[PDB]
Scaffold this motif. Structure first.
Motif, mmCIF file in Angstrom:
data_model
loop_
_atom_site.group_PDB
_atom_site.id
_atom_site.type_symbol
_atom_site.label_atom_id
_atom_site.label_comp_id
_atom_site.label_asym_id
_atom_site.label_seq_id
_atom_site.Cartn_x
_atom_site.Cartn_y
_atom_site.Cartn_z
ATOM 1 N N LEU A 14 -7.326 -20.535 3.130
ATOM 2 C CA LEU A 14 -8.295 -19.598 2.576
ATOM 3 C C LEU A 14 -9.431 -19.277 3.537
ATOM 4 O O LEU A 14 -10.325 -18.502 3.179
ATOM 5 N N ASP A 15 -9.422 -19.846 4.739
ATOM 6 C CA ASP A 15 -10.466 -19.603 5.725
ATOM 7 C C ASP A 15 -10.214 -18.356 6.562
ATOM 8 O O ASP A 15 -11.024 -18.047 7.443
ATOM 9 N N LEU A 16 -9.117 -17.637 6.314
ATOM 10 C CA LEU A 16 -8.839 -16.427 7.082
ATOM 11 C C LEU A 16 -9.827 -15.318 6.743
ATOM 12 O O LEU A 16 -10.230 -14.547 7.622
ATOM 13 N N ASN A 17 -10.230 -15.220 5.473
ATOM 14 C CA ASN A 17 -11.201 -14.203 5.085
ATOM 15 C C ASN A 17 -12.589 -14.535 5.616
ATOM 16 O O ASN A 17 -13.338 -13.637 6.020
ATOM 17 N N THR A 18 -12.952 -15.818 5.623
ATOM 18 C CA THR A 18 -14.240 -16.245 6.154
ATOM 19 C C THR A 18 -14.245 -16.361 7.671
ATOM 20 O O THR A 18 -15.316 -16.565 8.255
ATOM 21 N N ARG A 19 -13.084 -16.240 8.320
ATOM 22 C CA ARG A 19 -13.035 -16.318 9.776
ATOM 23 C C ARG A 19 -13.729 -15.126 10.424
ATOM 24 O O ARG A 19 -14.254 -15.245 11.537
ATOM 25 N N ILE A 20 -13.744 -13.976 9.746
ATOM 26 C CA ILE A 20 -14.419 -12.798 10.284
ATOM 27 C C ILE A 20 -15.915 -13.053 10.415
ATOM 28 O O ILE A 20 -16.539 -12.689 11.420
ATOM 29 N N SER A 21 -16.513 -13.691 9.406
ATOM 30 C CA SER A 21 -17.941 -13.989 9.451
ATOM 31 C C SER A 21 -18.283 -15.039 10.500
ATOM 32 O O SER A 21 -19.434 -15.101 10.943
ATOM 33 N N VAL A 22 -17.315 -15.863 10.904
ATOM 34 C CA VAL A 22 -17.585 -16.885 11.911
ATOM 35 C C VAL A 22 -17.746 -16.251 13.287
ATOM 36 O O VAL A 22 -18.628 -16.638 14.065
ATOM 37 N N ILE A 23 -16.905 -15.267 13.609
ATOM 38 C CA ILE A 23 -16.983 -14.621 14.915
ATOM 39 C C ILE A 23 -18.260 -13.797 15.031
ATOM 40 O O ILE A 23 -18.949 -13.836 16.058
ATOM 41 N N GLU A 24 -18.602 -13.046 13.982
ATOM 42 C CA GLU A 24 -19.800 -12.215 14.019
ATOM 43 C C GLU A 24 -21.080 -13.040 14.019
ATOM 44 O O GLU A 24 -22.120 -12.545 14.467
ATOM 45 N N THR A 25 -21.032 -14.280 13.529
ATOM 46 C CA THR A 25 -22.225 -15.118 13.509
ATOM 47 C C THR A 25 -22.550 -15.659 14.898
ATOM 48 O O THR A 25 -23.726 -15.785 15.259
ATOM 49 N N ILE A 26 -21.525 -15.969 15.691
ATOM 50 C CA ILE A 26 -21.742 -16.514 17.025
ATOM 51 C C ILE A 26 -22.340 -15.439 17.921
ATOM 52 O O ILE A 26 -21.790 -14.338 18.051
ATOM 53 N N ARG A 27 -23.474 -15.755 18.544
ATOM 54 C CA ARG A 27 -24.155 -14.824 19.432
ATOM 55 C C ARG A 27 -23.619 -14.855 20.856
ATOM 56 O O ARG A 27 -23.945 -13.960 21.643
ATOM 57 N N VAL A 28 -22.809 -15.855 21.207
ATOM 58 C CA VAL A 28 -22.256 -15.920 22.556
ATOM 59 C C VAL A 28 -21.148 -14.888 22.727
ATOM 60 O O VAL A 28 -21.047 -14.231 23.770
ATOM 61 N N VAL A 29 -20.302 -14.725 21.708
ATOM 62 C CA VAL A 29 -19.233 -13.736 21.787
ATOM 63 C C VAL A 29 -19.795 -12.324 21.670
ATOM 64 O O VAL A 29 -19.198 -11.365 22.175
ATOM 65 N N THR A 30 -20.951 -12.170 21.025
ATOM 66 C CA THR A 30 -21.571 -10.850 20.853
ATOM 67 C C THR A 30 -22.410 -10.495 22.078
ATOM 68 O O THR A 30 -22.094 -9.551 22.807
ATOM 69 N N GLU A 31 -23.484 -11.244 22.309
ATOM 70 C CA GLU A 31 -24.364 -10.968 23.432
ATOM 71 C C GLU A 31 -23.703 -11.369 24.749
ATOM 72 O O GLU A 31 -22.785 -12.192 24.794
ATOM 73 N N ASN A 32 -24.189 -10.770 25.833
ATOM 74 C CA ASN A 32 -23.648 -11.039 27.157
ATOM 75 C C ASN A 32 -24.272 -12.296 27.748
ATOM 76 O O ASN A 32 -25.463 -12.563 27.567
ATOM 77 N N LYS A 33 -23.453 -13.069 28.461
ATOM 78 C CA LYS A 33 -23.887 -14.337 29.034
ATOM 79 C C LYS A 33 -23.547 -14.405 30.517
ATOM 80 O O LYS A 33 -23.109 -13.413 31.107
ATOM 81 N N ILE A 34 -23.748 -15.575 31.127
ATOM 82 C CA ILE A 34 -23.388 -15.795 32.522
ATOM 83 C C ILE A 34 -21.883 -15.695 32.745
ATOM 84 O O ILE A 34 -21.428 -15.661 33.893
ATOM 85 N N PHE A 35 -21.103 -15.618 31.665
ATOM 86 C CA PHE A 35 -19.648 -15.473 31.708
ATOM 87 C C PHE A 35 -18.991 -16.647 32.436
ATOM 88 O O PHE A 35 -18.336 -16.495 33.469
ATOM 89 N N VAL A 36 -19.192 -17.839 31.870
ATOM 90 C CA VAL A 36 -18.409 -19.018 32.216
ATOM 91 C C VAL A 36 -17.302 -19.288 31.209
ATOM 92 O O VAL A 36 -16.590 -20.293 31.333
ATOM 93 N N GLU A 37 -17.133 -18.414 30.217
ATOM 94 C CA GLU A 37 -16.388 -18.736 29.006
ATOM 95 C C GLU A 37 -14.878 -18.782 29.201
ATOM 96 O O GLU A 37 -14.268 -19.837 29.010
ATOM 97 N N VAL A 38 -14.277 -17.638 29.550
ATOM 98 C CA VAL A 38 -12.834 -17.372 29.506
ATOM 99 C C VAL A 38 -12.285 -17.889 28.176
ATOM 100 O O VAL A 38 -11.174 -18.424 28.094
ATOM 101 N N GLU A 39 -13.067 -17.694 27.113
ATOM 102 C CA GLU A 39 -12.705 -18.096 25.760
ATOM 103 C C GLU A 39 -12.872 -16.920 24.807
ATOM 104 O O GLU A 39 -11.912 -16.495 24.156
ATOM 105 N N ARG A 40 -14.104 -16.407 24.713
ATOM 106 C CA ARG A 40 -14.428 -15.317 23.798
ATOM 107 C C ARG A 40 -13.518 -14.107 23.962
ATOM 108 O O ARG A 40 -13.396 -13.308 23.026
#
Lengths: 85, 432, 349, 85, 98
Positions: B100-126
């Motif tokens: 049942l976490d598939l519907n709430t998974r959308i809110s998890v991505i939008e809550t994280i500011r690292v995937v939204t805002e730009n960073k030093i780009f060490v991620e290769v994850e987002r």
């Protein structure tokens, strides 16, 4: 210059730069007092340089105000005449 | 040290909900911060900071877990690069839970500011996190919301990181752009990654997208000059990873594209092709039609055009098929162009009564295709209405007629010189 | 073999060296002599005509006056003004306490050279010149030596009063001799150590025979201004008082970054006392927090003076290890002398 | 790439790019086009990229000689280098 | 598969130019006859594949007289006989008759 001739320089340099959609360049334009073209170029460069140590890529609005106070002061600590008599 | 005793630190909080786990993470935040800071690259154990994720996973909602990552993002986080290893931990429980976490998974991505805002780009994850949100939008039936998310992700390109995988990320928007209903958006993306990967060798999974997206954009454009170009590049060069049984019929659609295109420079290249003459008869059947471009009488073409259509109205490995009228819409226009080029290079003048019988058209349809080729700078023909003839002879000045006469004079001297040396060469047989 | 090579060497004569000027015919060129006359010279069939084009320095003959050998471009090589004669002494562990200001140097040096692609995607231009100011004794000179013992690229030592040599237009041509190696070796950095000179002002009082110096001032206003390729060569400039230097040179476009090197504070000096006393033998019981409060307006170098005076105090008492009591006597000895001013620098920004 | 100087750059194109295209406009109107051009102002503001923008838009012969390079180590070479320009 | 090319036939002796006439060591002749073996039994796909290396080698390495052309045009004699092109079939049999 005035708020007219200056804003054409900020918008032109920002085309090659990368900034945030919430960043407002007009906030610093009102506060510009006795500046030139070379000073504006150093503001956009320093804003991108400090973003590396801050773990950022695009230039935010907070970095524009922090890097602006460095090149605005025209002599040492005194600006020009500062304020006193 | 203290990192190996973490298992025995708190006995009771393992078997209970442990509401104090938020306080235990803050106590270890300030202690391990001074021992690392920005000096040591890797000092503190990443599992100690990521332990809060494993404490509450299926026993608590993901809303409280996102609040912990927000405080660690605004603070130091015991390291400057610690965020790189924290999001890597986030990618584990996502695919192992679902339910049942598939519907709430959308809110998890939008809550994280690292995937939204730009960073030093060490991620290769987002980069994979953004793709997971788009795959959810495509399953919900939103074509516009899926293409707009990946459009802003491709603006920031990482320096090196993934090489072959990054190519798939660039080509992903080109597939979703056509589904949005606009094929011009994917044209800009084809002018960047293609130039960088032109000199670099591509693997099997790499060329699978170029086999489609390159010819899919020009499919809606109905321009066959770009369809037979990018297709033959991948077809002729390498292409050994596929099966040779299905590789041969791919060429059957390549020759069919040259007829619908305004001729080209690739027609003579396929005549000398080894695999084009032998193997499939449809390869030689379409190749035999290439030599008929100059000899075209138009007589037997509509007989075959109305009877045998192996590559015409049936497409499999290239267009997949559309309609019988769509494939024959531009087909009849080209066949007329093949005949007019022959008459212009053969008949100096011909009557309108005979020209209509050779083109199998009326008086209005005859002058329609002839006058269009004049404006394109291909065939120049003077139509004489009173004489009911069409003069295909182009006018030449006095200097042009004398120039060609000068080439013949220099050519006659070549035959005189050649024969002059043949007397001594053939003297061996004559003087024997 | 040494004697036979001497007779074979005397058979050879001198050979002039000049740069190719222009091209008239295929085998007929023009090369300017090193003395300043220009003579039309010939070539041979043993050399490649592709490398004979303009700007290439070739070898002429003192008699026939023809191009003979092709040599690489070298303009007044000087071992003292180019080669650094590197011997490892001071490292980042000795400049400690400046860590807040150390990342400023690595940002304009280590960052653009290691990953230049970062500045390209962001759009910002790599900083060209770097300004180092502040009162002397703060470790500003050691900042240039710490880089030479770490990276190892080609570096240039450029004294201010060594390039002022004056015959005819000499001071202006020396600056162009330095940038010749910038286009050859890309990872290069030009050091400037205590230079208040070439950045002067001096427009017209009558010029006091500054004719070559005024052009030398303009040399920095050309190479860092015009269309010559830049960004691969960093300019590290150090000066005492920037007010003496030309304000036009301090503005952006030439020196992009101004690195502040203030006096080390109580937290900055705390690590400096252990640097100067690291190799100095002392007793087992030691406290450096006492000299922190005893230091009034000192700098990083003045502590070396405190460690030096502490050694001579133990010589009269026959002590190989310096006692903590002898340290506090030497720390105040600098505070007793004074008369160094040091508070008159207002250029901190 | 340089904004706000359109007022200044307009007078530059009239005294540089205009006479290099149509030379009869000054003869019919009867105005002597300025042969030399001096650019004033505090150092570090104008000039610089302006001359490069004008030289690129003109697409013609361009000669940039530094003011401090005229002097040569030889004596009589000074006046000869000026003539060759 | 026992001989093939340059296995048992190449030890102390240089190249005699294959099996053209009488003396020789099999190199390009066996590879030409394998294509001829599949010419009268299997399809012509495997036969033309072996003829590609024969045409490039003949035009590269050759001599003044005609020897390899005998074995080369022998396979092409029956190769173009089953095809529909009689123009190239006459040119092949003309040089083979020489």
């Amino acid at each position: 210059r005035d708020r007219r001739e200056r804003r054409l320089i900020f918008g032109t340099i920002a085309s090659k730069m990368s900034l945030a959609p919430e960043a407002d360049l007009d906030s610093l334009i009102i506060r510009n007092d006795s500046l030139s073209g070379a000073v504006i170029a150093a503001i956009m460069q320093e804003a991108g340089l400090r973003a590396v140590r801050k773990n950022r890529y695009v230039i935010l609005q907070s970095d524009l105000e922090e890097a602006y106070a460095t090149q605005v002061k025209t002599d040492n600590t005194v600006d020009k005449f500062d304020f006193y008599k | 040290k203290d990192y190996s005793q973490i298992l025995k630190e708190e006995f009771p909080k393992i078997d209970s909900l442990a509401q104090n786990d938020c306080n235990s993470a803050l106590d270890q935040l300030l202690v391990l911060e001074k021992k690392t800071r920005q000096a040591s690259d890797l000092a503190s154990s990443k599992e100690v900071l990521a332990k809060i994720v494993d404490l509450l996973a299926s026993r608590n909602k993901w809303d409280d877990l996102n609040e912990q990552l927000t405080l660690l993002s605004k603070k130091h986080g015991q390291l400057k690069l610690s965020i790189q290893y924290m999001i890597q931990k986030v990618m584990e429980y996502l695919k192992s839970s679902k339910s049942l976490d598939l519907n709430t998974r959308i809110s998890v991505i939008e809550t994280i500011r690292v995937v939204t805002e730009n960073k030093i780009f060490v991620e290769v994850e987002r980069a994979r996190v953004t793709k997971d949100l788009v795959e959810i939008k495509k399953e919900e039936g939103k074509i516009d919301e899926a293409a707009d998310i990946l459009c802003e992700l491709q603006v920031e390109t990482y320096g090196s990181m993934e090489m072959s995988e990054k190519i798939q990320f660039i080509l992903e928007q080109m597939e979703l752009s056509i589904l949005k209903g606009d094929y011009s958006q994917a044209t800009v993306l084809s002018r960047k990654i293609l130039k960088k990967t032109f000199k670099n060798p591509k693997y099997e999974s790499l060329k699978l997208e170029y086999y489609n997206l390159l010819v899919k954009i020009s499919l809606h454009k109905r321009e066959y000059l770009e369809v037979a170009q990018y297709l033959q590049e991948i077809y002729q060069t390498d292409a050994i990873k596929s099966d040779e049984a299905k590789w041969k019929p791919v060429l059957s659609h390549i020759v069919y594209f040259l007829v619908l295109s305004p001729y080209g420079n690739l027609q003579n290249d396929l005549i000398h092709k080894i695999q084009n003459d032998n193997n499939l008869k449809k390869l030689e059947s379409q190749e035999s039609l290439v030599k008929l471009f100059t000899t075209n009488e138009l007589m037997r073409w509509p007989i075959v055009q109305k009877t045998y259509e192996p590559v015409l109205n049936e497409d499999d490995l290239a267009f997949g098929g559309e309609a019988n009228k769509h494939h024959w819409e531009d087909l009849q226009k080209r066949v007329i162009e093949h005949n007019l080029r022959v008459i212009s290079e053969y008949y100096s003048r011909i009557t309108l009564l005979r020209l209509n019988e050779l083109l199998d058209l009326t008086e209005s349809q005859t002058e329609t295709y002839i006058s269009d080729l004049v404006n394109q700078g291909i065939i120049y023909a003077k139509v004489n209405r009173p004489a009911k003839i069409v003069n295909f002879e182009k006018p030449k000045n006095s200097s042009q007629l004398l120039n060609e006469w000068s080439h013949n004079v220099d050519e006659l001297l070549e035959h005189i010189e050649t024969i002059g040396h043949l007397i001594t060469k053939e003297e061996i047989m004559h003087g024997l | 073999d040494k004697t036979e090579n001497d007779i074979k060497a005397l058979q050879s004569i001198g050979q002039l060296i000049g740069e190719v000027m222009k091209e008239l015919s295929e085998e007929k060129y023009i090369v300017k002599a090193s003395s300043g006359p220009r003579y039309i010279v010939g070539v041979r069939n043993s050399v490649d005509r592709s490398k004979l084009k303009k700007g290439v320095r070739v070898t002429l003959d003192i008699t026939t006056l023809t191009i003979m050998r092709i040599l690489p471009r070298e303009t007044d090589p000087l071992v003292y003004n180019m080669t650094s004669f590197e011997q490892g002494e001071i490292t980042f562990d000795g400049i400690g306490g400046l860590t807040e200001q150390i990342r400023e140097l690595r940002e304009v040096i280590e960052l653009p050279l290691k990953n230049p692609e970062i500045f390209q995607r962001v759009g910002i231009k790599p900083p060209k010149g770097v300004l180092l100011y502040g009162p002397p004794g703060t470790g500003k000179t050691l900042l240039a030596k710490a880089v030479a013992a770490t990276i190892g690229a080609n570096f240039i030592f450029s004294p201010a009063s060594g390039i002022v040599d004056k015959y005819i237009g000499e001071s202006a041509r020396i600056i162009r001799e330095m940038f010749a190696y910038a286009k050859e070796h890309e990872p290069c950095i030009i050091f400037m150590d205590e230079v208040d000179a070439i950045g002067g002002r001096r427009f017209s009082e009558g010029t006091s025979a500054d004719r070559e110096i005024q052009r030398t001032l303009m040399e920095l206003l050309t190479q860092m201004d015009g269309f010559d390729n830049l960004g691969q060569t960093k300019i590290i400039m150090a000066t005492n008082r920037p007010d003496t230097l030309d304000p036009a040179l301090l503005r952006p476009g030439r020196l992009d970054r101004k690195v502040e090197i203030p006096l080390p504070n109580e937290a900055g000096r705390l690590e400096i006392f252990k640097i100067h006393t690291a190799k100095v033998k002392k007793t087992g019981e030691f406290d450096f927090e006492a000299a922190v409060k005893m230091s009034d307006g000192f700098n990083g170098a003045d502590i070396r003076n405190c460690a030096t005076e502490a050694g001579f105090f133990a010589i009269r008492d026959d002590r190989d290890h310096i006692n903590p009591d002898d340290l506090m006597k030497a720390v105040r000895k600098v505070a007793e002398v004074k008369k160094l001013e040091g508070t008159i620098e207002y250029q901190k920004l | 790439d340089v904004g706000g100087l359109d007022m200044q750059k307009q007078e530059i194109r009239e005294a540089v790019e205009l006479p290099l295209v149509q030379a009869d406009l000054y003869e019919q109107i009867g105005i002597d086009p300025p042969r030399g051009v001096l650019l004033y102002g505090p150092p570090g503001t104008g000039k610089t990229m302006l001359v490069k923008a004008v030289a690129n838009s003109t697409k013609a012969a361009f000669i940039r000689v530094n003011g401090s390079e005229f002097v040569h180590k030889y004596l009589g070479e000074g006046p000869r280098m000026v003539r060759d320009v | 598969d026992d001989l093939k090319a340059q296995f048992q036939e190449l030890d102390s002796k240089k190249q005699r130019n294959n099996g053209s006439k009488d003396h020789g060591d099999g190199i390009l002749l066996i590879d030409s006859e394998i294509a001829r073996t599949y010419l009268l039994k299997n399809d012509l796909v495997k036969a033309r594949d072996l003829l590609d290396d024969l045409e490039k080698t003949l035009d590269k390495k050759d001599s003044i007289p005609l020897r390899i052309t005998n074995s080369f045009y022998s396979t092409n004699s029956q190769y173009f006989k089953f095809k529909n092109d009689f123009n190239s079939f006459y040119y092949t049999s003309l040089l083979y008759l020489s």
